Design a protein around this ligand. Structure first.
Ligand SMILES: [Cl-]
Ligand SMILES: [Cl-]
Ligand SMILES: [Cl-]
Ligand SMILES: [Mn+2]
Ligand SMILES: [Mn+2]
Ligand SMILES: [Mn+2]
Ligand SMILES: [Mn+2]
Ligand SMILES: [Mn+2]
Ligand SMILES: [Mn+2]
Ligand SMILES: [Mn+2]
Ligand SMILES: [Mn+2]
Ligand SMILES: [Mn+2]
Ligand SMILES: [Mn+2]
Ligand SMILES: [Mn+2]
Ligand SMILES: [Mn+2]
Ligand code: NA
Ligand code: NA
Ligand code: NA
Ligand code: NA
Ligand code: NA
Lengths: 185, 184, 185, 185, 185, 185
């Protein structure tokens, strides 16, 4: 009875395959073509207890933008498919994740209405090879296809890797809460 | 043994009857004479899983103030009665409720000491016919008779209906948490 | 064959029926339960040459918010359905509409990615009975279900009725341009 | 049949004759007694494809003000006459005209309601013998008798001749668009 | 007969071949040695309906500057050759292109007088491997050999890839408009 | 020999009938569909000694804007008709009207050139049901069809009803002066 969503989409720019189990055990199998994004998608599994499979190739010789965007769009669609009729779930999720000096709060509602409120202050332009502009775009695209209300608020942080990873930990744990069943419903 | 509180009070200005079940299933029956307040009281039921019955008539030809106040006072008293000795409950409740661009956090303690910390920025004076000054007065009056410590904090929001509705969603879910029993 | 999109949705709050003909002749048939919004929807027909049929009733005894939102959502869905595969259309639309002292520019792309950039300065809270906060929410909701990129920018204006009506005229003409066929392709 | 408007008016100060063909081929025939204004009126023909005939003499021994004003008034009246019932025309016109470093946007509506929004920053007081205060007065007077809604906005420019000429190019192209027939209606 | 311009130039730094068809069907054939610039040149084809063939190699072991510059110079020369006597063309082009949150307006005139007005605010120094200083230099060099008046103005935008891509979409559509024939003349 | 002007105009939005006697005795018969506007039009009669008849119905279910505008336009046309050749009249009018704490000066010229200079500071958005944005629009529209130069300047005032009523008293008395005959002419 596990809630599994899957999305495959091939364009001239990217080839994306995503599978997510909302009732998973934290199995991570992420090969997006973007190593830092893979590290962040691993946090979805380890902290959200989702099973997350992502396989993507794309025009990373231009930059990571199209791959990042199309992976995020596909995850949002897979999430929407896995949620089904959304009956009985908590629907709302909240979590404040510290990572050393970083502290990020995520508040979300599986509402069917896309909205991103985004207030991160990432002080460097690259983490490894990853363009830090792509963090906002990842969550914006995921919101757009999942129909999620998502608020990301940075309360502390100076290390870009810490800020982004804390965001994914908080998102993962908030999304876990929202997708879990409300025992009184 | 569901925890049910009830308050009826008739004054020269208003006639108010309130019944709340802390262990409800979200049954909403709200007819306060103020349609937007009814919509907000419905959030108490649907998001707090309270059973909420409010029936009020009043001098709404003056304005909604006396009705709004007397309904809020009665709800706080009904909540206090329903809580009884408060043994074994979580007592504290916390929730951040987004509603599109709005985000409101509610933190409360069923402490017996009334206090309202209120920091909403509602940018318009009317939602429908509802005077938005009445939002603060609703929570102040409810706090005063329930003896609740209540903190309402707006983190984002531009639409007045969204801000107020997010506040009631967060309040409902925080109050649900506070009234539920601590398993340990 | 004319491109027609139609959507009916009944909720506990609203009862909404929408039909739009992208290849219309300007037939205006708008009865949303919100008279000023009807006047604005008429601009879609008169200036966009769309055939626009909207019939809605709702919980306007609370306020106009739910009706306004559900009408906007339904129009966006009807627009999306009417566009079909979007093959051969201009896709982009641009128009600056004056209305006396008001001047509003609209730029849009039928992109499949929802985004609203909104920069109006409406100086009063009510036009008739219409809550002027509902203008932004109308376009946000329409954007969300149509998948449109939409930018609304006020360059001039002091009368709220003029500002909002100029916005709908500019939107109507930009959308007409975007939905029309590109004769070269 | 071409839409032609013609107006002659003789006062104690000026003697003005104007004929404009909205469906012209760009015939420029401008002898206002103000050489720089003639150069600007030529842009109406060359860029708007109007046929523009202006012949004026006046009390230019005082200054160019009365001639400038009476020419502008007459052009607006001729334009109004030529438009007739305005059935089937685009009615709105928009154009951004660059001239080297200058860039001026014109937005107009053949509305029947006079309004001038004017935001040029002309940095010198004379172009040749032409008093640059007369630019605003020209468009104000033309607006007043034509019943036009007209917005002129400078986005760039440092040379007064360039700024004014770009304004007339943009006006010419916007007016051409507004007076042309809408092929769909 | 299609208007085709072609230019080959070999220097000690670069080897550049360009062919452009002003009356094309959107054939994109761009291999400049700079992958992000290739992606931008593709917009010329996809949104301008030009046929754009660019093949360049160069001293990219130093940086992309010489290749970027020499490609831009060659495109401007090819455009100039293809335009011929410019008889009968619209000559002016205008377009506002959104790309999600980005919005860029381009206004241009095929005037024979080079000028670049450039007002982009690109917030990162690299898109992929592409140095974002090269955007201004690309358009400056293209302007210089084509003899174009070109104004680029950013109205919105936070993602560098979006801002630059919106600029090339707007440029492509403005240039398409300017090079197309004026049906009335 | 009384100077009487009359205007009837029926549109899809409004049905307006106006009759004004410049040589009246202050007979007021105003039913515009806007009660506060009726009160203001009564001031024209009582303070200007005009006979003022206005009968209007319109789409006041939207708001009062279209009715307000069309009544003002019709009054301006009726005024222009009543003035005839304007021979022998004072032409200029000036009056400062106090109303308790409010003080408003009106200066006008029956010039044939429309202009409104408007400097009121009305501190509330509604007087009764009347939208105070409509005051400026009333005088602007009246100016546009009458061809009047009109300057309205607030020197004092805090009560919106007082400010607007003082404006109409001052306008009425200034217009009375301007329409009266100059005994030396
Ligand atoms: Cl606003
Ligand atoms: Cl100036
Ligand atoms: Cl920059
Ligand atoms: Mn993108
Ligand atoms: Mn790490
Ligand atoms: Mn009170
Ligand atoms: Mn609601
Ligand atoms: Mn809403
Ligand atoms: Mn209107
Ligand atoms: Mn003058
Ligand atoms: Mn010149
Ligand atoms: Mn260089
Ligand atoms: Mn791209
Ligand atoms: Mn108006
Ligand atoms: Mn009074
Ligand atoms: Na943000
Ligand atoms: Na209607
Ligand atoms: Na000449
Ligand atoms: Na390529
Ligand atoms: Na003013």
């Amino acid at each position: 009875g596990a809630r599994i969503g899957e999305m495959k989409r091939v364009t001239k720019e990217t080839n994306v395959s995503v599978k997510i189990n909302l009732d998973g055990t934290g199995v991570a199998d992420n090969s997006s073509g973007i190593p830092f994004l893979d590290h962040m998608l691993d946090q979805l599994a380890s902290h959200g207890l989702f099973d997350v499979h992502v396989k993507a190739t794309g025009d990373t010789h231009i930059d990571d933008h199209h791959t990042n965007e199309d992976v995020a769009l596909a995850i949002g669609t897979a999430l929407l498919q896995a949620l089904g009729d959304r009956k009985g779930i908590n629907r709302f999720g909240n979590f404040s994740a510290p990572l050393d000096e970083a502290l990020v709060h995520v508040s979300l509602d599986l509402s069917g209405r896309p909205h991103l409120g985004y207030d991160l202050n990432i002080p460097t332009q690259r983490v490894g090879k990853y363009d830090t502009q792509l963090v906002e775009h990842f969550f914006q695209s995921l919101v757009n296809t999942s129909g999620m209300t998502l608020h990301i608020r940075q309360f502390s942080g100076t290390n870009s890797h810490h800020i982004i990873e804390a965001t994914f930990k908080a998102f993962a744990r908030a999304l876990r809460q929202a997708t879990e069943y409300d025992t009184r419903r």
